[PDB]
Write a protein that binds this ligand. Structure first.
Ligand SMILES: CC[C@H](NC)C(=O)N[C@H](C(=O)N1C[C@H]2CCCN2C[C@H]1C(=O)N[C@@H]1CCOc2ccccc21)C1CCCCC1
Ligand SMILES: [Zn+2]
Length: 94
């Protein structure tokens, strides 16, 4: 109900969106899909199925989980998978 994109709540559905993911991008679909993200079909742009947070310009060593907590800390999917303690840790850096 509060989920932004219901058709993207499964990991499998999120993985299917990466068919046209440019292989030049250093961050892999598995890492993104695990962290709630699916590809929206432009550039390297992804969104979270739950909170609708959008991220782009992925560089090597970027951790989608950490980016999720940094920019979109009140996402329910993030809080339930990784825990509020994790979200507080990341927020405590920046
Ligand atoms: C994702 C990790 C990446 N590491 C270099 C990163 O930090 N990306 C930033 C990023 O993705 N951001 C930045 C933060 C600052 C305030 C909120 N922003 C969220 C995110 C972003 O720019 N998202 C855009 C906003 C417009 O809507 C969409 C839609 C889909 C995908 C991305 C976005 C930003 C970096 C500078 C160049 C543009 C991208
Ligand atoms: Zn989210």
């Amino acid at each position: 109900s509060s989920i932004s994109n219901l058709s993207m709540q499964t990991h499998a559905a999120r993985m299917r969106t990466f068919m046209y993911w440019p292989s030049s991008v250093p961050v892999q679909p598995e890492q993104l899909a695990s962290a709630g993200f699916y590809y929206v079909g432009r550039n390297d742009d992804v969104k979270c199925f739950c909170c609708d947070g959008g991220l782009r310009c992925w560089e090597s060593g970027d951790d989608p989980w950490v980016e999720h907590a940094k920019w979109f800390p009140r996402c329910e999917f993030l809080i339930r998978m990784k825990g509020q303690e994790f979200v507080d840790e990341i927020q405590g850096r920046y």
